[PDB]
Design a protein around this ligand. Structure first.
Ligand code: HEC
Ligand code: HEC
Ligand code: HEC
Ligand code: HEC
Ligand code: HEC
Ligand code: HEC
Ligand code: HEC
Ligand code: HEC
Ligand code: HEC
Ligand code: HEC
Ligand SMILES: [Ca+2]
Ligand SMILES: [Ca+2]
Ligand SMILES: [Y+2]
Ligand SMILES: [Y+2]
Ligand SMILES: [Y+2]
Ligand SMILES: [Y+2]
Ligand SMILES: [Y+2]
Lengths: 471, 471
């Protein structure tokens, strides 16, 4: 048994686990070191056009350390500027994979209640970032999935549940609680008090399997759409970090190598085995992350990964360039009077093209985890985009614009203009939120004992729209 | 030293090496077991359209055992029906990678002379198939490259020559004498007798590197074309089994695993090491070919290779379908009166699209040797094809045929009709050649002592146009 077999008071706060596991706590906190903010819309402006009419066209950055998950959830322009617990663009489900306070609240008020309401609803309750309680039982310290939607998805896919899985599998599944693709399923229900409520439940689109094509069929079957494209008015599907799903198609995943083997490698100290909890880039610690199974120079292994990235980049830019043009050309055809009937097939091609290409790039490590599937998907996506563009030429020709040239979107600025994203306004509004409601959230949480100020050190120095500079 | 340190009389005939190496001779002869003829034009009729106006649109089969190399060179419709040593469609260079008699003749008459004249020129001299002398020195038995064009290509690419390479590298380079992409360079020269002659020299397009893109730049720089497309009149480039070049981009090649490690695995017998000379499919002998480095079930490893093949197939069919349509649509535009000036850009896209896609599939093992490069190349090729088709729509529209639908070519029969290939005639003509001139070639060779009848056992029972049935 552990030294805390009856549970841990204040378990949601990882600092509460330090007295029992100083080592794991210490390395866990070091994800603070990965504080770089890479503005993906600036790096890949084509993404702005792809996501026109959706929050991702406003703000989308690459992932950084777990230490910043909660704060980035707050800082992203995607969550907007609520004025209270009933305002704001997004729902409560946006907290789900950002805090150990999530299972705390789900365990206290129930799944449906948690998934009911605005994101702003839990502003002063969900204040801790990715912590011990998100992956560990506070009595036995064993690995555990704290979110019901995962087992729900695993079952539907014909997979064993978390409890039924092997230890090695659990070393990847704890990650799968968050590092997976999902959608919000509008769900009606009634509380014990009789009140009728509507919940937005996190659901893994795995009922037909975990391949991109199976998920596609899944979404088409229920005629689902995450949003109607702001430019082409196409029923779009958004892919979100399907890290685990893609990893499963890769050679490492097929061989049984877990996420932890590379991202949380062991360190033996005579009888005692320690897992590095500083979840980050394995390439920074190759001796422990790779050389334990590979017998090759670190530079060569690094060069190989670099090659894979270049390959992915090559196909990514091609696919999203044609996808972008397709959206714009469809928008042009619409302007000339083309009917929905004339654009139906084209829009279906665009929907599938982007779903496949987004699934390929949404998982930032997929280019390495499953290179072959990433390349094939980008190629498949590009083909659907081009099929749409060949048909678009004919629609444009019918309306006298066969020589139309879709505008360029090589910079985030130009792309956001086409996507009609008023950045200055969103940023101004966001800052007001942060300077008022956010600080009130933090002050109240600290007063109630839900948040420890120590955890806020250097947590809010950067975002895509501001950089106070240092550490 | 060996037991034949002064050389071997009749070295071109592998049977002459049997007295010294019965083991290697025995397994070497067993490639006779791989006698399957897979008609690739029947399997992938899109290839017929791609190669319209070129010999490959007539006959193209997958590779089988080395035991059949020489005979298949004779049977393929590509070599046609010579009536003497000065007739026939192809040059003498077509023997180059099919017989140990090649180095014998090159060593006797010189490189230029060998590469001068018709294929039919050496009909009764080049009669032995891939043999010991193609890869071994007849005095020391050491591995050796017998063709000057290889070192020539290696140097141009910044690689070390064969003699400068390591032993492990030689285990792959002996294969590179033939398993590489090449072109015939028209070369003028004068013999010691003063006569002016024209030679067609085998040349490796490696002066800018061995990547598909570098070879492309190489061919474009000299405005080279293997043929003018019979349908689109595009200056085409033909890729031929770039097995070694692609293998070099793969993980095995980068790690130093040679062709021999998988295709000619060792067998230890107490102090004595034997190389299995039955060059074939490693998957038939996985315990010796793969399990020597991998610790996984054979079925799983097989399933993985199968996955890679399906991935390649997926992208291959897409690329060649769009390439086929592009050719046909260009042909249609031509019929309507489109000018070469209006079709120049389109034709450049088609040339590059097919060069890249052909380079990806011409090496039948590339899907496994270098999966990532194969997928990327097929994707790149497809994109160039689609860029051509988008432009083609506009050219067709200008000429009043925007709704033109390129004819289907889902069967070899339909494809060969579009490619205007009169098969019945070519086959009839070929049979007459085989029944007359070919038999005379074999009778004369046997009479002169250049050919041993034993080597002809079951060598000519199959082709793409006839199957006497058994072994
Ligand atoms: C509601 C729609 C959500 C909002 C708003 C955010 N998320 Fe997530 N999220 C999750 C993971 C595993 C990552 C990291 C890997 C990756 O991003 O590719 C993220 C990351 C973010 C970030 C930082 C990156 C960015 O700028 O986009 C933000 C700002 C963010 N998320 C906001 C996981 C999950 C998840 C688990 C299943 C859900 C339901 C959500 N995220 C929902 C939202
Ligand atoms: C002159 C233009 C040539 C003719 C006619 C043939 N070849 Fe070749 N060839 C070589 C290899 C390594 C292979 C095997 C791998 C593969 O085919 O992908 C081949 C195979 C053939 C075959 C059998 C397959 C088929 O039906 O196409 C035939 C009929 C054939 N070749 C005819 C190697 C070389 C090579 C070495 C550099 C040269 C110069 C040529 N082949 C030339 C011709
Ligand atoms: C949900 C509660 C999560 C769990 C469980 C795990 N991760 Fe995570 N991860 C999550 C978020 C929201 C983020 C984004 C953080 C941000 O503010 O940008 C991440 C990020 C990562 C990263 C990126 C690290 C970096 O760039 O420095 C990696 C490599 C990563 N996560 C890996 C990972 C692994 C292997 C996990 C299981 C052991 C794991 N995460 C769990 C959310 C969640
Ligand atoms: C999920 C994303 C995790 C978070 C957040 C934390 N831990 Fe963890 N821990 C995780 C894995 C996958 C593993 C390895 C499991 C295995 O048996 O292989 C661990 C392991 C531990 C252990 C056991 C000893 C060790 O391997 O180091 C302990 C005691 C432990 N973790 C503690 C711990 C604490 C205190 C955390 C918060 C500060 C914490 N973990 C977070 C995954 C995750
Ligand atoms: C052991 C548990 C492993 C760890 C940790 C890492 N790798 Fe690995 N890798 C391993 C296996 C068993 C295999 C499958 C092939 C086999 O030998 O059975 C691989 C394969 C690769 C590959 C080749 C496939 C490819 O995508 O090109 C590469 C390039 C590779 N591994 C790199 C790599 C790196 C950089 C790692 C650290 C981040 C890493 N591997 C860890 C086993 C294990
Ligand atoms: C070793 C073989 C790995 C396994 C198993 C998993 N990951 Fe990984 N991951 C690995 C590498 C080499 C990289 C690329 C590093 C680079 O910067 O080039 C990644 C990357 C990720 C990322 C992207 C992080 C970022 O860009 O900020 C994430 C979020 C990530 N990996 C998650 C993750 C998960 C959840 C895994 C299991 C399903 C997983 N990785 C396995 C190496 C390895
Ligand atoms: C030229 C003289 C060659 C040398 C040297 C090597 N190969 Fe070859 N190979 C060559 C030809 C002309 C053919 C086609 C034979 C036919 O009649 O179809 C082949 C075929 C192969 C195959 C296919 C085997 C099968 O399908 O059963 C393989 C796997 C192959 N060759 C491999 C290979 C290797 C690894 C070599 C070096 C050790 C090698 N070949 C040398 C011509 C020549
Ligand atoms: C090229 C395509 C080859 C042909 C045709 C033949 N041999 Fe070969 N042989 C080849 C390789 C790549 C190797 C391995 C080299 C190494 O040292 O790793 C060999 C090896 C031999 C040997 C050495 C002992 C052994 O490894 O078995 C002998 C004695 C030998 N080869 C003989 C031989 C004979 C008699 C052949 C014709 C019947 C023959 N080889 C053809 C490549 C090739
Ligand atoms: C030893 C000399 C090898 C032989 C013989 C074969 N493989 Fe291999 N393989 C080997 C290494 C060193 C690596 C690189 C990764 C590493 O562990 O360092 C690999 C990798 C693979 C892979 C993974 C990459 C991929 O394309 O998915 C696979 C699937 C694989 N090897 C399969 C395989 C098969 C089927 C073999 C026999 C025909 C084979 N390998 C032989 C080393 C060696
Ligand atoms: C092991 C890791 C290999 C190395 C190294 C090389 N080859 Fe290979 N080759 C290997 C496999 C698993 C396969 C596919 C088998 C299947 O049928 O699925 C191949 C295939 C080829 C082929 C195609 C043969 C045919 O389709 O008839 C050829 C001609 C071939 N390989 C040649 C070859 C050469 C010359 C290599 C070195 C440059 C080489 N292979 C390396 C496995 C391995
Ligand atoms: Ca989604
Ligand atoms: Ca060529
Ligand atoms: Y405590
Ligand atoms: Y990162
Ligand atoms: Y691979
Ligand atoms: Y003799
Ligand atoms: Y074969």
């Amino acid at each position: 048994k552990t030294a805390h077999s009856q549970g841990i008071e204040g378990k949601a706060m990882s600092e509460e686990w330090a007295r029992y596991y100083p080592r794991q706590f210490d390395s866990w906190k070091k994800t603070k070191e990965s504080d770089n903010i890479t503005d993906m819309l600036k790096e890949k402006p084509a993404l702005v056009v792809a996501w026109a009419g959706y929050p991702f066209s406003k703000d989308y950055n690459a992932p950084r350390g777990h230490y910043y998950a909660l704060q980035d959830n707050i800082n992203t322009l995607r969550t907007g500027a609520p004025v209270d617990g009933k305002t704001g663009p997004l729902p409560s489900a946006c907290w789900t994979c950002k805090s150990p306070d999530v299972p705390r609240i789900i365990e206290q008020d129930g799944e449906l209640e948690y998934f009911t309401g605005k994101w702003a609803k839990y502003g002063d309750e969900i204040v801790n970032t990715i912590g011990c309680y998100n992956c560990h039982d506070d009595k036995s310290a064993e690995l555990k999935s704290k979110v019901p939607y995962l087992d729900r998805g695993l079952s539907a896919a014909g997979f064993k549940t978390f409890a039924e899985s092997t230890h090695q599998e659990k070393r990847s599944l704890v990650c799968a609680q968050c590092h997976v693709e999902y959608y919000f399923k509008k769900t009606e229900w009634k509380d014990d008090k009789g009140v009728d409520k509507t919940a937005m439940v996190v659901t893994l689109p795995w009922s037909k399997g975990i391949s991109t094509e199976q998920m596609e069929a899944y979404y088409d079957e229920i005629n689902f759409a995450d949003w109607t494209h702001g430019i082409s008015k196409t029923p779009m599907l958004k892919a979100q970090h399907p890290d685990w799903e893609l990893y499963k198609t890769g050679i490492h995943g097929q061989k049984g190598v877990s996420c932890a083997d590379c991202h949380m490698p062991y360190t033996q100290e005579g009888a005692v085995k320690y897992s590095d909890h500083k979840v980050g880039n394995p390439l920074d610690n190759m001796d422990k992350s790779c050389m334990n199974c590979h017998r090759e120079s670190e530079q060569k292994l690094k060069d190989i990964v670099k090659q894979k990235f270049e390959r992915k980049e090559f196909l990514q830019d091609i696919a999203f360039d044609n996808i972008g043009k397709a959206h714009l050309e469809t928008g042009k055809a619409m302007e000339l009077g083309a009917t929905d009937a004339e654009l139906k097939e084209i829009r279906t091609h665009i929907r599938h093209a982007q779903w496949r290409a987004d699934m390929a790039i949404a998982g930032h490590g997929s280019f390495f985890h499953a290179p072959e599937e990433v390349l094939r998907l980008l190629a498949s996506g590009n083909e659907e985009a081009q099929k749409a563009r060949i048909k678009l030429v004919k629609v444009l020709a019918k309306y006298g614009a066969i020589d139309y040239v879709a505008p360029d979107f090589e910079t985030k600025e130009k792309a956001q203009k086409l996507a009609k994203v008023d950045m200055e306004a969103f940023i101004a509004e966001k800052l007001k939120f942060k300077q008022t409601l956010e600080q009130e959230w933090k002050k109240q949480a600290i007063a109630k004992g839900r948040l420890n100020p120590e955890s806020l050190k250097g947590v809010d120095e950067k975002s895509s729209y501001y950089d106070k500079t240092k550490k």
